Design a protein around this ligand. Structure first.
Ligand SMILES: *[C@@H]1O[C@H](CO)[C@@H](O[C@@H]2O[C@H](CO)[C@@H](O[C@@H]3O[C@H](CO)[C@@H](O)[C@H](O)[C@H]3NC(C)=O)[C@H](O)[C@H]2NC(C)=O)[C@H](O)[C@H]1NC(C)=O
Ligand SMILES: *[C@@H]1O[C@H](CO)[C@@H](O[C@@H]2O[C@H](CO)[C@@H](O[C@@H]3O[C@H](CO)[C@@H](O)[C@H](O)[C@H]3NC(C)=O)[C@H](O)[C@H]2NC(C)=O)[C@H](O)[C@H]1NC(C)=O
Ligand SMILES: *[C@@H]1O[C@H](CO)[C@@H](O[C@@H]2O[C@H](CO)[C@@H](O)[C@H](O)[C@H]2NC(C)=O)[C@H](O)[C@H]1NC(C)=O
Ligand SMILES: *[C@@H]1O[C@H](CO)[C@@H](O[C@@H]2O[C@H](CO)[C@@H](O)[C@H](O)[C@H]2NC(C)=O)[C@H](O)[C@H]1NC(C)=O
Ligand SMILES: *[C@@H]1O[C@H](CO)[C@@H](O[C@@H]2O[C@H](CO)[C@@H](O)[C@H](O)[C@H]2NC(C)=O)[C@H](O)[C@H]1NC(C)=O
Ligand SMILES: *[C@@H]1O[C@H](CO)[C@@H](O[C@@H]2O[C@H](CO)[C@@H](O)[C@H](O)[C@H]2NC(C)=O)[C@H](O)[C@H]1NC(C)=O
Ligand SMILES: *[C@@H]1O[C@H](CO)[C@@H](O)[C@H](O)[C@H]1NC(C)=O
Ligand SMILES: *[C@@H]1O[C@H](CO)[C@@H](O)[C@H](O)[C@H]1NC(C)=O
Ligand SMILES: NC(=[NH2+])NCCC[C@H](N)C(=O)O
Ligand SMILES: [Zn+2]
Length: 875
C-alpha cells in the first residue's frame, strides 16, 4: 500500500541477482515483537557503498511490509529526496526511486538507507516467528529466527545474498520477563517502560544475512568454558534442563578439537545453542547462536537410544564445523553450497571421533554418506556438485544428498589421496586467505594445490563439474577401464551434456597381499590403465575410499563368495560392506548377474559386524520391497534372510549390553529379524510392548523403537493406540515423542490411521516441524503406503498454503512414492503431477521419484525370474 506492488520491469531490479555496485557495510537493526499479538515492528538503517550512477536502490523483502516511506542519506549526511518506493514481487525486491540519482562513494563515507517495517510471527517456521510450550501448566512463548537460504528477507529488509557480507549491531525491545539472545554477547540493557527492556548486542564481525539470528526466550541454561576461556552455553527449558548435559559435553570437546585442528580462533566472544520447540530444519549454524530441533540437541541417557546419542553428537559437531566453514569463509554463491555443507558433513565425523573414541565414526561415513549417495548419484536426475540455481526454489532444493553426502564423500577421497596431513594444512591456508570473505570452488583447489603441488584442480574438477560417478571394469585381474555408472541401462550415458564427457580422473588405491599402492587414473587414458608380486587377487578400492564402484570379473566375484563362506574375516568389515554394496548395485544396474550378487549373502550366518549387516539390510530392503505383493517370491526371500540373521539376532538378544557399535548392530539386526517375520523376535516385541502398556516398565533404550513399531503392528488396537497417543503428549523428551509417532504409524488399522492423518491439521497435537515425518512414517505402513500418498493428493492445496512451494520438506514429500513399481502407480503419479504442475522446491524430487518408479517397473520385468530361480533352487 505504501510501497505498492508494481509490474514495472524496465529496470535492473528485473534481474534475479542483486547488482554488483551496491554493497552494504553495516546494519543497524531494531525489532520489537508483540508476542501475544503475533506481530513485530522494526527499523533498519543500512550503510551502503555505491559504485555506479543509479536512480534506484533495491533489496530483498518478502511478506513483511514497509510501514512508511524510506529515507536516504548522502555520504555527506544530507537527506536524499525520494519520489517513490514500490515492490517488485517477481524477484522479491522492494525498490525506492530518488527524485535524483547519485554518484559513487569514493572515500571512507557511505550512504545510509533507513526503512520501517512490520511483519507476522504466526503461520510459519521461517523468518522471525513465535512458538509455544507448556511449563508447569502455563503456556509460554519463545520467538526466534531461521533464515537459510533466502528467509532473512522475511525477517527484515536486507541484501539477502551470501556474498553481501556486512557487519551487524542488533537491538530488541521485549517484555522484561524475557531474555534476548543474538549472534554477539549482550552490550547493554535499558528499561523502556517498567514493563519493557531494550537489549543491544555488541558489533558483529562481517557476516552473511542468512547467519543473522535473534531470539526472545525464558529458557534456563547449562554452561561450559572452552580452552579459549569463552563461555559455551546451551539454553533449554527448565523441565528439560537435565537433557542438555550431553550436548554441553560434546560442544566443549568438539569446539576445542576444531579450534586446534583448523589452527584458527573462533571469531566470536561466545557461542550459544538453543532448541526451538517448533523448528523447520535439523539445526542452523547461526554464528554464535546455533538453533536446533530438540531431537538433535536434547538427549537423556536414561531414555534416549545410542542412535539418538550419535545423532546429537554428530549434528552438534556439524554445526560447530560451520563456525569455520560457512561462517568465517562463506561460498560466493549458492552454486558453491557444498563448500559449506560438504565440509561440515565431512568434518562432523572427525569431531565426534575425537569426542567418542570407540564409535568407529570414520568407518560409519560409509553408512551415513558414501554408500547412500552412490544410490542417489546413479540417477539421470542427479546433478553436479557445482549447481546452476536461478530462483529461491532452486537454491533451497540443492540442500540435498549431493551437497552434503557426495560433498563429504569426495573430500574423504581427496584427503586419503592427498594424505591427511596435507589436506589439513591446505584447509588452514584456505581459512587464512578468505576469512570474512567469500570463496569459489576454484579457490579451494588452489589452496590444497599449494599444500600438495598435486594436480588438485585437474582431478577434482571431474568430480565436481559433472554429475555421476564411474564403475571400474576389471579385465584380467589387473586391467581396469572406467565407464559411467547408471542404474538405468536404457539411459543415455552422455546426457545431460558434459564438457568432461563423463570420464574422471580417479585416484585409485588397491591392496596386494596386505600392501597398498596408488595410481591416478587419467581421463585421457581412453583404453584404460594397468595396475602395477605376481598376484592371484587384487582388492581394489580398500574401505570404499574412492567414490566409484568396482566390477570384478564374474570368476573373481564367484571366488569372493567362496572366500566369504570359508573365512569372511579375510576381508575387513568395511571391505565386506563395500563388496556387498557394489555387487547389489551392479545387479540392480544389469551389470552383474543377480545370482552372483546373492551368492555373496550365503556366509551371513557368521557375519557379526555392523557395516556389512547395514549394507546387506539396505540391499535386501529394496528387493523385498519390490516383491511385497508377490506371493510366490516373498515368502522365500523372507524365509532365507530370516535364516541368515537369526544367529546374530539370537546371539545379541533383547537387552542393552555391549559397546556403542554393538548396540547399534543389535537394533538393526533385531529390526531386520522382525521385518523378515521371525516369530520369536516378533514375540519379544509384543511381550515388551504389553509390559510397556502396563505403565511402569521403562524399556531398554536401544529396543524401544522396535518395540513400539512391531508391538503396535502385531498387537496394537484402539485401547493401546489411544494410550500411546496420550504418552506421546505427556513425554517432554522429543526423541521419545518421535519414536511414539513411529509406533502410532505402525497400527494395522485403517480407521486409526485415518484419525492419525486428521491429526496432522491439528497444531495442538502434531507440531508443524513433524508433519512430514509423520506422513512418511504412515507411508511405511502396509495400508498407509497408499493412505499417505492419497492424503497428500487430497490435501495438496492445504499443504501448499500452509508451507509454501519454497518449503524443501514439502517438495520432498513425493518421495513417499519411491516403493511404487507398476505402470498403474506411475500413471497416478504423473496424473497428480500434471494436475499440480507448479512444483516449486519439489521440482527435483519429482524428477527423481519418477525415475526411481520407472526403474522399479523395469527392474521387476528384468529380474523376477532370475531372482525366483536363485531362491527356489536354494530352498
Ligand atoms: C525372544 O526370542 C528368543 C530368541 O532370540 C526366544 O528364545 C528361544 O526360544 C526357543 C523356543 O522356546 C528355543 O528353542 C530351542 O532351541 C534350542 C537350541 O539351543 C534347541 O535345543 C531346541 O530344539 C529348541 N526348542 C525346543 C527344545 O523345543 C531357543 O533356544 C530360545 N533361545 C535362544 C537364545 O534362541 C524367546 O523365547 C523369545 N521371547 C519371547 C518372550 O517370546
Ligand atoms: C552362484 O549361484 C549359482 C546359481 O544359483 C549356484 O549354482 C546353483 O546351486 C544351486 C544350489 O544352491 C543348484 O540348485 C539345484 O538345481 C537343480 C537343477 O535345477 C535341482 O534339481 C536341485 O534340486 C537344486 N537344489 C536344491 C537344494 O533344490 C543349481 O543347480 C546350481 N546351478 C548352477 C548353474 O550351478 C552356485 O552354487 C553359486 N556359487 C557359489 C555359492 O559360490
Ligand atoms: C497471521 O495472522 C493474521 C491475523 O489473523 C493473518 O492475517 C489474516 O489473513 C487472512 C487471509 O489470509 C484474512 O482473512 C484476515 O483478515 C487477515 N487478518 C489480518 C489482521 O491481516 C495472517 O495471514 C497470519 N500470517 C500468516 C503468515 O499466516
Ligand atoms: C559430561 O562429562 C562428565 C565428565 O567430563 C561426565 O561426568 C563423569 O561421568 C563419569 C561416568 O559416569 C563418572 O565416573 C564421573 O564421576 C563424572 N565426573 C567427572 C569425570 O568429572 C558426565 O557424565 C558427562 N555427561 C553426560 C551427559 O553423560
Ligand atoms: C480398527 O479399529 C477400529 C476402532 O477401534 C475397530 O472398530 C471397532 O470394532 C469393534 C468391534 O470389533 C466395535 O466394538 C467398535 O465400536 C468399533 N469402533 C469403531 C470406531 O467403529 C475395528 O474393529 C478395527 N479394525 C481392524 C481390522 O482391526
Ligand atoms: C480413543 O480415542 C478417541 C478420540 O479421543 C475416543 O473418542 C471418540 O472419538 C471420535 C473420533 O474418533 C469422536 O467422534 C467421538 O466423539 C469420541 N467418543 C466419545 C468421546 O465418546 C475413543 O472413544 C477412544 N477409545 C477408547 C477405546 O479409548
Ligand atoms: C588466538 O588464540 C590464542 C590462543 O588461545 C589467543 O592468545 C589469541 O588472543 C588469539 N588471537 C587472535 C588474533 O584472535
Ligand atoms: C591388459 O592390458 C595389457 C597392456 O595393454 C595387455 O598386455 C594385456 O593383454 C591386457 N589383457 C589382459 C587380459 O591381461
Ligand atoms: N529453511 C531451511 N530448511 N533451512 C535448512 C538449514 C539447515 C542447516 N544448513 C543444516 O543442514 O544443518
Ligand atoms: Zn550444514
Amino acid at each position: 500500500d505504501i510501497c505498492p506492488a508494481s509490474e514495472d520491469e524496465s529496470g535492473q531490479w528485473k534481474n534475479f541477482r542483486l547488482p554488483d555496485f551496491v554493497n552494504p557495510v553495516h546494519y543497524d537493526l531494531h525489532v520489537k515483537p508483540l508476542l501475544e499479538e503475533d506481530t513485530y515492528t522494526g527499523t533498519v538503517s543500512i550503510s551502503i557503498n555505491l559504485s555506479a550512477p543509479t536512480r534506484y536502490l533495491w533489496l530483498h523483502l518478502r511478506e513483511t511490509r514497509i510501514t512508511r516511506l524510506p529515507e536516504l542519506k548522502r555520504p555527506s549526511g544530507d537527506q536524499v529526496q525520494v519520489r517513490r518506493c514500490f515492490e517488485y514481487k517477481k524477484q522479491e525486491y522492494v525498490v525506492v526511486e530518488a527524485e535524483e540519482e547519485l554518484t559513487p562513494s569514493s572515500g571512507d563515507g557511505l550512504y545510509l538507507l533507513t526503512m520501517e517495517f512490520a511483519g507476522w510471527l504466526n503461520g510459519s517456521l521461517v523468518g522471525f516467528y513465535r512458538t509455544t510450550y507448556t511449563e508447569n501448566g502455563r503456556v509460554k512463548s519463545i520467538a526466534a529466527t531461521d533464515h537459510e537460504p533466502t528467509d532473512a528477507r522475511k525477517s527484515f529488509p536486507c541484501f539477502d545474498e551470501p556474498n553481501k557480507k556486512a557487519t551487524y549491531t542488533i537491538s530488541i525491545t521485549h517484555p522484561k520477563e524475557y531474555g534476548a539472545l543474538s549472534n554477539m554477547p549482550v552490550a547493554k540493557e535499558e528499561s523502556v517502560d517498567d514493563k519493557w527492556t531494550r537489549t543491544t548486542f555488541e558489533k558483529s564481525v562481517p557476516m552473511s544475512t542468512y547467519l543473522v539470528c535473534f531470539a526472545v526466550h525464558q529458557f534456563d541454561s547449562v554452561k561450559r568454558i572452552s580452552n579459549s576461556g569463552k563461555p559455551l552455553t546451551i539454553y533449554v527449558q527448565p523441565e528439560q534442563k537435565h537433557t542438555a548435559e550431553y550436548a554441553a559435553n560434546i560442544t566443549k570437546s568438539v569446539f576445542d578439537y576444531f579450534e586446534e585442528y583448523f589452527a584458527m580462533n573462533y571469531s566470536l566472544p561466545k557461542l550459544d545453542k538453543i532448541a526451538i520447540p517448533d523448528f523447520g530444519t535439523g539445526a542452523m549454524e547461526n554464528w554464535g547462536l546455533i538453533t536446533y530441533r530438540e531431537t538433535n540437541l536434547l538427549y537423556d541417557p536414561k531414555e534416549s537410544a545410542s542412535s539418538n546419542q550419535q545423532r546429537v553428537a554428530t549434528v552438534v559437531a556439524h554445526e560447530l564445523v560451520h563456525q569455520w566453514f560457512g561462517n568465517i569463509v562463506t561460498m560466493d554463491w549458492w552454486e558453491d553450497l557444498w563448500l559449506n555443507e560438504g565440509f561440515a558433513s565431512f568434518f562432523e565425523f572427525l569431531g565426534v571421533n575425537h569426542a567418542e573414541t570407540d564409535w568407529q565414526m570414520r568407518d560409519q561415513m560409509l553408512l551415513e554418506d558414501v554408500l547412500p549417495v552412490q544410490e542417489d548419484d546413479s540417477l539421470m536426475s542427479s546433478h553436479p556438485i557445482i549447481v546452476t540455481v536461478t530462483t529461491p526454489d532452486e537454491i533451497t532444493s540443492v540442500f540435498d544428498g549431493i551437497s552434503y553426502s557426495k560433498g563429504s564423500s569426495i573430500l574423504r577421497m581427496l584427503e586419503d589421496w592427498i594424505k591427511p596431513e596435507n589436506f589439513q594444512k591446505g584447509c588452514q591456508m584456505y581459512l587464512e586467505k578468505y576469512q570474512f570473505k567469500n570463496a569459489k570452488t576454484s579457490d579451494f583447489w588452489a589452496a590444497l594445490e599449494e599444500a600438495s603441488r598435486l594436480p588438485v584442480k585437474e582431478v577434482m574438477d571431474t568430480w565436481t563439474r559433472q554429475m555421476g560417478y564411474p564403475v571400474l571394469n576389471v579385465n584380467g585381474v589387473k586391467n581396469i577401464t572406467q565407464k559411467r555408472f547408471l542404474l538405468d541401462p536404457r539411459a543415455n550415458p552422455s546426457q545431460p551434456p558434459s564438457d568432461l564427457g563423463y570420464t574422471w580422473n580417479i585416484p585409485v588405491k588397491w591392496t596386494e597381499d596386505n600392501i597398498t599402492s596408488s595410481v591416478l587414473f587419467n581421463r585421457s587414458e581412453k583404453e584404460g590403465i594397468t595396475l602395477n608380486s605376481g598376484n592371484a587377487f587384487l582388492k581394489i578400492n580398500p574401505d570404499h575410499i574412492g567414490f566409484y564402484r568396482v566390477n570384478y570379473e564374474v570368476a573373481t566375484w564367484d571366488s569372493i563368495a567362496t572366500a566369504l563362506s570359508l573365512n569372511h574375516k579375510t576381508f575387513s568389515s568395511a571391505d565386506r560392506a563395500s563388496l556387498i554394496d557394489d555387487a547389489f548395485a551392479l545387479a540392480r544396474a544389469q551389470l552383474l548377474d543377480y545370482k552372483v550378487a546373492l551368492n555373496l549373502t550365503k556366509y551371513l550366518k557368521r557375519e557379526e559386524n555392523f557395516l556389512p549387516w547395514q549394507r546387506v539390510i539396505s540391499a535386501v530392503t529394496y528387493i523385498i520391497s519390490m516383491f511385497e505383493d508377490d506371493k510366490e517370491l516373498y515368502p522365500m526371500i523372507e524365509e532365507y534372510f530370516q535364516g541368515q540373521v537369526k544367529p546374530i539376532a539370537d546371539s545379541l538378544g533383547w537387552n542393552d549390553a555391549g559397546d556403542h557399535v554393538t548396540k547399534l548392530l543389535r537394533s538393526s539386526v533385531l529390526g531386520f529379524a522382525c521385518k523378515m517375520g521371525d516369530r520369536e523376535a516378533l514375540n519379544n516385541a509384543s511381550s515388551l510392548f504389553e509390559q510397556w502398556l502396563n505403565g511402569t516398565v521403562s524399556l531398554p533404550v536401544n529396543l524401544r523403537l522396535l518395540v513400539y513399531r512391531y508391538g503396535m503392528q502385531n498387537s496394537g488396537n484402539e485401547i493401546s493406540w489411544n494410550y500411546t497417543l496420550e504418552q506421546y503428549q505427556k513425554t517432554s523428551l522429543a526423541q521419545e515423542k518421535e519414536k511414539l509417532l513411529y509406533g502410532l504409524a505402525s497400527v494395522k488399522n485403517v480407521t486409526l490411521l485415518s484419525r492419525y492423518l486428521d491429526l496432522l491439521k491439528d497444531t495442538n497435537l502434531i507440531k508443524t516441524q513433524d508433519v512430514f515425518t509423520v506422513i512418511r512414517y504412515i507411508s511405511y505402513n502396509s495400508y498407509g503406503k497408499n493412505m499417505a500418498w492419497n492424503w497428500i493428493q487430497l490435501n495438496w492445496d492445504y499443504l501448499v498454503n500452509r508451507y509454501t512451494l519454497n518449503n524443501r520438506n514439502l517438495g520432498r514429500i513425493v518421495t513417499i512414492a519411491e516403493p511404487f513399481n507398476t505402470e498403474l502407480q506411475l500413471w497416478q503419479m504423473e496424473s497428480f503431477f500434471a494436475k499440480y504442475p507448479q512444483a516449486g522446491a519439489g521440482e527435483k524430487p519429482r524428477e527423481q521419484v519418477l525415475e526411481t518408479v520407472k526403474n522399479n517397473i523395469e527392474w521387476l520385468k528384468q529380474h523376477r525370474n532370475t531372482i525366483r530361480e536363485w531362491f527356489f533352487n536354494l530352498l
